Amino acid sequence: DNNVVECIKEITESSRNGKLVFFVGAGVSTLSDYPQWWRLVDKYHEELYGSSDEYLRIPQIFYNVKGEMAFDGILKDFFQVDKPTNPIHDKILAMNPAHVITTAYDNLIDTACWKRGKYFSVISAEEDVANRYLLKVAGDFRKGFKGENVVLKEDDYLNYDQNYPLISNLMKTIIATHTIVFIGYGLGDYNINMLLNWVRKLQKDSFHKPFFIRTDPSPIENETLIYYENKGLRIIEYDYLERYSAVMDLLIESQENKFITKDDEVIDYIYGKISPLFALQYIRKIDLKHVFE
Amino acid sequence: LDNNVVECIKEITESSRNGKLVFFVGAGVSTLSDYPQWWRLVDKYHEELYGSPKKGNYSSDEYLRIPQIFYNVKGEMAFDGILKDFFQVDKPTNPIHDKILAMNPAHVITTAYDNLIDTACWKRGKYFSVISAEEDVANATSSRYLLKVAGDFRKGFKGENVVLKEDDYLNYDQNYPLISNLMKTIIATHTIVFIGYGLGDYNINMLLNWVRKLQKDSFHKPFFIRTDPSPIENETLIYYENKGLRIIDAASLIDSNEYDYLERYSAVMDLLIESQENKFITKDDEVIDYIYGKISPLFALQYIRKIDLKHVFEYDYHFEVNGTVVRHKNKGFGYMERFFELKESCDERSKLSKKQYERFNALFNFFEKNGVICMAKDAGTLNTSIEINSLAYHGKYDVMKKFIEEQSVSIEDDYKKAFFLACLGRWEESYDLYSNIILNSIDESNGCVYYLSQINRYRIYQSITQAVTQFNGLGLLTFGRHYKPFTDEFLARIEREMTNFNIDDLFNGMPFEFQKKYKILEFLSNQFLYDDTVKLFELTNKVRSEMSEGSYSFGMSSDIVVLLRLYDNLRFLYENCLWSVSFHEFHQYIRNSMSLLIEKAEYERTRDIDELGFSFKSGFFMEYYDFVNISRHFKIDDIKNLERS
Amino acid sequence: VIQDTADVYFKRKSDGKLVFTAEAQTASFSQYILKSEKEINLTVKNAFFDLEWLASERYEVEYRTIAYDIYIQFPNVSPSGEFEMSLEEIKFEALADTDTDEMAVVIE
């Protein structure tokens, strides 16, 4: 797919120019193995008795009836596990991400980033921007295992404008100012793409069509393709690790020698290489070592 | 002078050397540049509309009433005609733009229709991405942004490029959303310093109250320099503090006329330009607390060269290898001289807090540990002192085996054991220990050990790689066997682990405050000993030049400089446990230095004696340290040439 | 007259098998029963090793150039190994047998 090739070109150039930001969803946590939220949804379904509306309303009744202490206890036993990292994190860091946006409440990506030498700044609460940015748009359990520290109900999404104004504002700033690649997005954050639709109404032609890695096991249908044309997302199931590594090997490796086969094209390639040196009047032989890597 | 203004200056200077400061410029710099003003354009609109400018009675209503009347009555083509007539002239800029840009803003946000600031940005040398329209954010190349609220005339002289009408401000929410989002992001993230207005940009002031009502005291209080020559109503100043504004009056510094505000526009900013921390430090307890806060985070090391010390103190003093101090760029208070004056008198040592007094004694122990002895004028004779505490230096191999086998508790002791394990051939095991040291020191509140472990990990990766490539080739010819002591598992693991791993990013890799406290450690960041080999080479030229004829190196002589630089570099590399002592170029450095010292000894013992030599011995004596330096870093042919010479 | 760019073939006394091929850059000759010691040293670049040979020991050196057909043979040699390491060349020395102490063969 030539769309994938042009995605690789733009993302590599954005990495070399600092214009690349990777969006993280939740499936990368499954790539290094983690407890899954819908199992806790089914736990609440069994516990409360004795739809997407129900996905937060059943926790809302659970907070209203069973109380906050049951939420604290059942979040403690579900979010105290420890796991290692996956090489998908290492390939993301090999693609050198400027910022990290995610909703998954595990900081294993932070430990993987500190396995690399670079430093990111954790931004979860409101006071974090006052002091490379790790944007936890859903928060995490750094301060405590409290329900208010993260998002748990519909009313969190209702009050998200006043609860986290600066997080969403600088999130939109990063969305505008950099090329965005959406990995791990399981097509659940419909408010995010609705805000993207509003930004698409703001932007029109300057909207860059940022690329969303779908990788649903079915091939993309015609109505779905027209939908992603409406939504401006170029498109990139138990073998998600293999398919993501297969795409990102072609992304990272980025061989010029793949386009070096015929004698005619490489003449134009070298002419593109020594294009600006016609302006200067003399060069050195050792400086040619800095041309061709 | 007011001390709150002093700490405001301190806050913006630390933001400036952090690089997180952004200047907002209003419309005052157009008045300084003799640009055509807006109110006389309103007067022009008033005379064309009403058929007379009359008295005018130009008020805040008439600022936002008259061009609306111009638009609906006289159409839009006469607007373009007046805009061509009045905003076509050009003029060179002021020094004010240069001293605004001299504080190195990350981004610059403006509200003036001209383009003098962009021309000054090109004059400064750097490039800033000009963001004047909503389409400009898409092709935003540089990370340094020129943000533009009022637009400019680069898109022609149409009405859509400009924004002056009130309904444009009404539609401004949908007209420039992303510009507003950029503005809110910059004022949230960076410290913003306000200039160029007369407290009348009330829509922007309501935006300031909007971020105030959205962030409270977590929002940093922005700074504005009041350029009105009258005395400031202090109740309104406190009200602006209640609004969350830190205003500094120009008239508080100096006041004359009203048109001299341009000079005032220089003067306070001139006070910003030469603003030095040691300028305001006027008492001795402030001196010892300042040098504690400037030095005492460097307690974690073992040995540091004296020539590195000039990186700490902004090259205000020269710290030479003998241990003396020379004033070089220190233009404020003589705080190092006052420090040694405090060291002179025990009575002055009593006139201090005893916490500060034991801090003074701890820093005294540090300076005697690094051998800093007085200024050049204060000191007289000096002694060459040699001390190495390294176990690997003296070759206590079995003692190193026992210490490796001993109990490992401290991560600093773990780093020392990893250096021993690298020095005792357990290279993959030492790499594993380095990786576990990094994993333990993920959040251990000192990145110094992290920096050293990363550097040694990269060097031992390259050492293992070059060793396995030399094992692949002629080692088979030498031994009659491939004899490979390694397997590809950790080779592939370190290959993927060191993929795209540069070295110069590592100094950028640490946080901002680590850079601001440990810029002295930049030496470790691929050109090891490059400048030191340059200094060795030029001193080699000087030594052979004075060797070629009769000379009398009075007092300090270059062999002392060579010997002290050698022993200083050797002690700093060995004592802090850096693996790079194994490498070949350092051996070449030791070879050149020791050969020059030996040749100096031969020329001293063999030279003729004239009357001044009779009017004025000092033969070189070899030491056990010299025997170690001979044995570690030489090759048989070179010492055969030393026999020949 | 000699173009002074010779080429070296490095062989082994067993089978006459070629070990590698290179070109030399530095060579150093230095010093009743008259006793005189002479020493030879050779330095070549990164050679062309033979993968066929990948599938102590005595080796020999031949050293060929043109003078206008001048060939040099050293029958007994040792490639002394020097392990080094750095950031970001093969040296030989002679061997003189105790049976017939001969070192240099010249074919003109």
Place this chain on the structure above:
Amino acid sequence: IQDTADVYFKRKSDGKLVFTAEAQTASFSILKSEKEINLTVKNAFFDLEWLASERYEVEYRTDIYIQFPNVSPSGEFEMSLENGPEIKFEALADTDTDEMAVVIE
């Protein structure tokens, strides 16, 4: 018996000191004898009230005194890009009063 010496450079039209410094390096070289001495000397401070040809004289002290009344300064041009002070002067020799070795022990 010590080694470190202070140098004093003055002008013999008023006997007034021009600058003082520390010694760094000497340079030596009916028949005729050809010897020439040139001196290099490190950083110094000049005379402030001097700011308001001639002959010049140099004194060395370390008591041991080495003086000579026939010197001329040679300030060679330098061009350093790092930046962040050297004084070079040579001896002179007239005809009738050729005398350059004043010593006090």
